[PDB]
Design a protein around this ligand. Structure first.
Ligand SMILES: Cc1cc2nc3c(=O)[nH]c(=O)nc-3n(C[C@H](O)[C@H](O)[C@H](O)COP(=O)(O)OP(=O)(O)OC[C@H]3O[C@@H](n4cnc5c(N)ncnc54)[C@H](O)[C@@H]3O)c2cc1C
Ligand SMILES: Cc1cc2nc3c(=O)[nH]c(=O)nc-3n(C[C@H](O)[C@H](O)[C@H](O)COP(=O)(O)OP(=O)(O)OC[C@H]3O[C@@H](n4cnc5c(N)ncnc54)[C@H](O)[C@@H]3O)c2cc1C
Lengths: 587, 587
């Protein structure tokens, strides 16, 4: 029980000190290590319920039961007199750096998960390398350190969403008494992109500085795992070499897919290209119906674009479909066109992009609906958002022995371990996990603590809240209504719902009865809240706090007994009373 | 136990049906009452754990143990055959309307609490009257039905706050690529006020329609409780009459105080006057430091005003004082001036308000600091925000026997009962309770259900969340840091905190390290979250959801195990790690 925890902690930690808060001899070692700038984990036995049991088991590794005890890479190094002997003899540095591998930890991938894992590991004295390489898109687009979210994901996406939201703010300002001539207002795409990219650049730079300041080795190199402990790296001069590592974290993420049709790769673009595009896309076709497709279509329309979304079947597959339809209805009522039950067959080039005068080209898109009928229309830009895929070398991962699933993602235990015992996987390539930035970050940080600081806490992947940053935002935590009904049966599900109107929308003359929220509850479990859903402004800020309560097992009664904050949109969750079964209107 | 619950329910309900969901004879009575449009409460005994015990005790009131049983104002009226005998004989209407008093419920006051209580009571067949009268301010300002929040409180305040926030949005829009000439943009106060007042008018109208549609008698009359069951009303022709009621709810609220100095009443105004003021206040002095003082000063400055706040001692007394200082620092850095440790002595008139050309007057304010030094400066408008007070006739409430405290507020039990057994008090006049609109609404609705539908649930007044809508908003739920330390001692309090920067502020070039959040936790109680505090945009939307988790007893570990939504401000609450005791910088 505790002896198997101690065994795992001793074997895996790079540099660890077993201590007690009140222990002058422990402080002597702590001060020596701090003066030597030797980073390490510290476990204060007096603060653990099984502290006394741990102190006894330590003798199985050191032949002593006292504190302090210092370990390096699985080996007891000494008590205080011994550590200080190494110190005063200029021997300690060599002792604590001795290793069978080049690194304690090699992270392949410098994105959300990998940077979090590598920084956290270094905190405990793990000798750490982070590898990051950004393979250029088909048109040649590349970017700096930080991964998908920082460079071509959440960060630029939400900044362009804000630019789009500011359009409504300009409209609203007049109703609130501001005098501005909107005949004269227009949007400049390249000025926005320059501001977005300046911020991204500050993040690229910040991550580099952070790795330096934590003594992490950053290699701008492509990595390949060729055996359980061997990573082959290729640098930008195409020099190939091998580095070894005790633990390996795979954190390589995904990249956009293209449909297998003529012209897609040559003439279309993806979200990878959009966020640094030097020209305004112009009349744009977005192919796909994911949150990325709808988010990008949404802000392009708000920035003055002529935008069409081509939808194969449904919107936001995997999300609550009542909410998805309300998201789409708002977009269609606010300037976004939809080509329904339609797929593309080929992209034909009519004009080449004019890179010197910074203007888009022109394309002919041919496709068809499922009545067999044809689709044919011209667009300046075609954006594919038809899913993302991992890029793992299946033949290579096989020969190392890392098991992948149908889709090319890594099959992991609940502590992120692959089928190779020293190799772990985090983030978007971890099969079955929500593909979100804070998930990758929590997984990587928590994994690093287990590996190098004796922690036991696992990442909890259930009831992870999300927000779709469409023109009217959609936040959710927990089950869709249809998923709850499938699990438990319609007679065991109660749904409370209401429309609402933000107070800000009254003077602005925006819509009554578009914003909407519901709670999906389980009758036979004290009206447990299984899922929360809100369509409205600032939906991510609304949703976040409730995710804590849902993780704690909130019931409808817990929402009712809480008092609202007035005036807010969120307070409507504390006074819901109309049930769907009652048939009463939610207006 | 259950017999005393039944006794109380039978005695207090106006019209109540004891039933079981599966009971054709109950449905026969239900359909008759619905066809007769007789409103009533219904208790389905099969849905109560003590249902069988209740069914037996009913024989103590009716001599029968079966369902259905119908009661009116404490008297068993009959089983199904009997009710249907009354129906087919055109006798039922007279039966269910027979009463010793004119009304089952008289509500004195038509604001947040009173309207909620009166509407909810009528739902269960209580014959209900709501009295509302708005005594004019010293300069003659009056308004319609709905109370303080609707007319001169949360609603207009937050709409003018939004007008102020739109100023920053105009500035931000340029950085996000919008081209607008801000040399040419200005704000028109009267256009804003017209829009705000149009919305308020729609609310006045809506409440009137709602009372009509619920068959509540609305009297625009001043009410006085002259004996436990007698309310003297004075209508707008000054006709005096008396109405009687079984239960009385006092819900009369508060009005602004004036300092006892020469010129205050004659020449200054309060928040009652501000929200319909026909002229822009101009150069304004706000006397006071409450949330009302700072909210009003904040939006007046953002709308182009020259604004000074005169502070006797501290800001936001009763709120967390670290947060209060951060609120004030932001205001002082964004255009609001403060006269510190200063009080007024007299207001002198230099120019009369020009009502015909809609322009303010001019005033001379004389005051002093606590070094004895003098204050003397001219202002166009002087707004007092030095607290609010109940307006109850202490001599009258005494002779009826309703006990008041030091401050003139009503001393109530935990079920809102006064010292007179049929008289209750809700909202701002209920001593010791948080003076907020959703508190008054919950108290009134929950009271109405206990009185007329057999409910037992009490209003929970603990950990009620709040938000101060200053230019940078401040949301809070639970204890201030200083209150937690006083209760439990510094060694038992841990505070986790962080600065943050909204992503929206990056491209807009707004401040690093002004937005701020902290969690005040109790070490010896599993790091229980005692108080949550956030300074930032949309602070009310951020805070609300956490209030559910805090009511459920959230710990720091419950916050940590929850995954953030990215990118949001709120997600920072899920990754806090810097403690104040550590001394580490929260930047
Ligand atoms: C348009 C878009 C919008 C999004 N919006 C949100 C949002 O709003 N909120 C949210 O939570 N999530 C959002 N996401 C998802 C979020 O971006 C991902 O969940 C997150 O980036 C995954 O983190 P990761 O560490 O697994 O992978 P990544 O961030 O993709 O990092 C992987 C890194 O490893 C590099 N790499 C790949 N192979 C190698 C190799 N052999 N050697 C070295 N380096 C390699 C990759 O080039 C990359 O830099 C969005 C995604 C997209 C595409
Ligand atoms: C500037 C300001 C801003 C505020 N902002 C917020 C906020 O943002 N969020 C929040 O939760 N709270 C806010 N409040 C507080 C909120 O307005 C009060 O908590 C709420 O209005 C109290 O409700 P009530 O029913 O007790 O009293 P009221 O709403 O004041 O209603 C009492 C009614 O009874 C009338 N009346 C008085 N005497 C009689 C009589 N003898 N006969 C008949 N009628 C009578 C009164 O004129 C009034 O109409 C604010 C208050 C102010 C002044």
């Amino acid at each position: 029980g505790t002896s198997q925890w101690l065994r795992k902690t001793v074997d895996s930690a790079a540099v660890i000190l077993f201590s007690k808060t009140t222990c002058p001899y422990c402080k002597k070692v702590k001060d020596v290590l701090a003066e030597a700038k030797i980073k390490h984990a510290t476990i204060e036995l007096d603060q653990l319920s099984n502290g006394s049991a741990i102190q006894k088991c330590l003798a199985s590794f050191s032949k002593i039961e006292t504190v302090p005890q210092m370990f390096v890479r699985g080996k007891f190094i000494g008590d205080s007199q011994t550590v200080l002997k190494y110190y005063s003899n200029d021997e300690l540095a060599g002792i604590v750096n001795e290793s069978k591998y080049d690194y304690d930890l090699i992270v392949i991938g410098g994105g959300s998960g990998g940077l979090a894992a590598g920084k956290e590991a270094a905190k405990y004295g793990a000798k750490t390398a982070v590898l990051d390489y950004v393979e250029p898109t088909p048109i040649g687009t590349t970017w700096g350190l930080g991964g998908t979210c920082v460079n071509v994901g959440c960060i630029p996406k939400k900044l362009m969403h804000q630019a789009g939201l500011l359009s409504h703010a300009l409209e609203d300002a007049e109703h609130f008494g501001w005098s501005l001539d909107r005949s004269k207002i227009s949007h400049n795409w390249s000025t926005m992109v320059e501001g977005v990219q300046s911020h991204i650049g500050s993040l690229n730079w910040g991550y580099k500085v952070a790795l330096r300041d934590n003594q992490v080795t950053y290699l701008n190199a492509k990595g390949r795992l060729i055996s359980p402990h061997e990573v082959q790296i290729t640098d930008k001069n195409q020099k190939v070499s091998t580095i070894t590592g005790n633990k390996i974290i795979l954190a390589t993420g995904e990249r956009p897919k293209y449909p297998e049709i003529p012209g897609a790769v040559e003439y279309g673009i993806t979200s990878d290209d959009l966020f640094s595009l030097p020209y305004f896309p112009g009349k744009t076709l977005v192919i796909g119906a994911s949150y990325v497709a709808l988010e990008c279509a949404g802000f392009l329309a708000s920035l003055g674009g002529d935008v069409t979304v081509m939808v194969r079947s449904i919107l936001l597959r995997g999300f609550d479909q009542q909410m998805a339809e309300k998201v789409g209805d708002y977009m269609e009522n606010h300037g976004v066109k939809f080509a329904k039950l339609c797929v593309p067959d080929e992209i034909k080039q009519l004009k080449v992009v004019d890179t010197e005068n910074n203007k888009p080209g022109l394309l002919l898109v041919k496709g068809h609906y499922t009545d067999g009928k044809k689709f044919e229309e011209e667009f300046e830009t075609v954006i594919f958002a038809v899913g993302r895929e991992p890029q793992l070398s299946k033949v290579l991962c096989e020969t190392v022995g890392v098991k992948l699933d149908k889709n090319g993602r890594v099959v992991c235990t609940d502590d992120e371990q692959t089928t190779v015992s020293n190799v772990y996987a985090i983030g978007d390539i971890n099969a079955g996990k929500p593909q979100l930035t804070p998930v990758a970050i929590q997984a990587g940080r928590y994994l690093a603590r287990r590996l190098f600081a004796g922690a036991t806490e696992l990442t909890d992947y259930s009831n992870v809240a999300t927000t779709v940053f469409t023109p009217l935002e959609y936040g959710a935590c927990g089950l869709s209504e249809e998923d709850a009904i499938e699990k438990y049966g319609d007679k065991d599900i109660e749904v409370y719902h209401s429309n609402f109107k933000p107070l800000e929308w009254t003077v602005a003359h925006r819509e009554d009865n578009v914003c909407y929220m519901k709670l999906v509850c389980r009758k036979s479990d004290n009206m447990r809240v299984l899922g929360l859903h809100v369509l409205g402004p600032n939906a991510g800020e609304i949703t976040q706090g409730y995710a804590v309560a849902i993780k704690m097992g909130a019931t409808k009664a817990d929402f009712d007994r809480t008092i609202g904050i007035h005036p807010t949109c969120s307070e409507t969750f504390t006074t819901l009373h109309v049930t769907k079964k009652s048939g009463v209107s939610p207006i």
